[PDB]
Amino acid sequence: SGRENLYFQGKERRRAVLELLQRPGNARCADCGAPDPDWASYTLGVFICLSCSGIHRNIPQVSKVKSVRLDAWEEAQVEFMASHGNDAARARFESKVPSFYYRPTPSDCQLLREQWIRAKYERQEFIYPEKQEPYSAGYREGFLWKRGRDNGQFLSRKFVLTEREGALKYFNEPKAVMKIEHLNATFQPAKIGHPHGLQVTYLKDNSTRNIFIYHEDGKEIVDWFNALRAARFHYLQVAFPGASDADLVPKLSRNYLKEGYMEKTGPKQTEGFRKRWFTMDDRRLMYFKDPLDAFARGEVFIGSKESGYTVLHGFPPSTQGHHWPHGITIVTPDRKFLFACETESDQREWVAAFQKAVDRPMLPQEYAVEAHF
């Protein structure tokens, strides 16, 4: 007779709420992919993580959120979640997401995660694809705040990204014409000192230039970032014909595997140790006196073990003059580099980044790159 009573009725209601999290399609946050989302937008019908729920809470005309475990649910609300959910959302709100569009993860800055949510649910850019034209048309112009090479100041400059000319250019007759093949971009809000800060890099003469820009409008800077990825995508299809689209997407733009301060010495190993900001981009290791420098003090190619590159914990017994005690030795065919890290946790992370590069076979295109150093 237990089935006939009000306690059973309630237990079934409670089980129905929790059951929605045990469907495979709802195993990860709809927006950033974090595992085991505990929150739901009951107007959009998605299951999202605590962090994403806060972003949603901030578009209250579109999304209302509450906890699947801790808040009360009306029957109709549970039935709404059950008829929607994360797979449904993917088919609706991610119906027409361009292959080049950057999909954020929990590690990404607030700007990326917020604008992903706004593009999907607020602006509905992937439901109504004409809204994608600002960054999908192969031409984009606009003004951005650009840091001076050496002067610390941000000034308004017109940028033009033109796939037809194969370049990003800007004017201060352009001041610079930067070929797409040599461009990368990564959001760096903490380094730049602005939440919408984007770092754009350009390789010429085997020397990387850092350009540091922002826009007051978060949508506009993220649209520049994705426009640059679109341009990169079209360039790569041309340089690598018969590479699949999926093959190309990881190459469109590259976040840095690691950055941070280390001390280094010179080619003799006796010169004295100097603090530098290091950035590891794929196989290119760049070191700067300051992170916002336009140019590196030096750049090192980290090739594969098949070409005689290796990485070791520690320093040789000879070594003197350093004061951070956690050493890393990089052996290249031409030079032994000695870097010192302030902590063991950082040493471990640096060795792991260098080891990943050494352990991976070189790609065809990387042989000519190596040749330039």
Ligand X SMILES: CCCCCCCC(=O)OC[C@H](COP(=O)(O)O[C@H]1[C@H](O)[C@@H](OP(=O)(O)O)[C@H](OP(=O)(O)O)[C@@H](OP(=O)(O)O)[C@H]1O)OC(=O)CCCCCCC
Residue 113 CB, nearest approach to Zn ion (Å): 7
Residue 115 CB, nearest approach to Zn ion (Å): 14
> 57, 90, 274, 360: which one contacts ligand X (CB under 6 A)?
274
What one-character DSSP code corresponds to residue 77?
Answer: H
**Complete DSSP assignment for 145-198:** EEE-SSS--EEEEEEEEETTTTEEEEE---SEEEEGGGEEEEE-HHHHTSTT-E
Residue 337 CB, nearest approach to ligand X (Å): 8
Nearer to ligand X, 86 or 265 (CB): 265
Q: Does 52 bind Zn ion (CB under 5 A)?
A: yes
Tokens of 304: 């594969």
Q: Does 321 bind ligand X (CB under 6 A)?
A: no
Q: Does 49 bind Zn ion (CB under 5 A)?
A: yes
Enumerate residues 6+ apart whose C-beta is below 8 A from 213: 144, 145, 146, 147, 159, 197, 198, 200, 221, 224
Nearer to ligand X, 244 or 318 (CB): 318
- Cα–Cα distances (Å) from 96 to 70, 120, 188, 372, in that order, read 34, 10, 28, 41
Q: Does 247 bind ligand X (CB under 6 A)?
A: no
Residues closing a segment before a gap in the chain (C–N exceeding 2.5 Å):
172
Residue 272 interacting entry, from ligand X, Zn ion, none, C-beta within 5 to 8 Å by type: ligand X
In terms of DSSP H, where are the helices of the chain? Answer: 6-19, 50-57, 75-83, 86-93, 110-117, 133-136, 189-192, 218-239, 245-248, 344-359, 364-372
Q: Does 266 bind ligand X (CB under 6 A)?
A: yes
Q: Does 55 bind Zn ion (CB under 5 A)?
A: no
Q: Does 114 bind Zn ion (CB under 5 A)?
A: no
Residue 298 CB, nearest approach to Zn ion (Å): 39
Give dist(CA 160, CA 214) in Å, integer.
Answer: 15
Nearer to Zn ion, 31 or 281 (CB): 31
Nearer to ligand X, 13 or 297 (CB): 297
Binding mask 4-43 for Zn ion (x = CB under 5 A): -------------------------x-xx-x---------
- For ligand X, the binding residues (CB under 6 A) are 264-267, 271-272, 274, 276, 287, 297-298
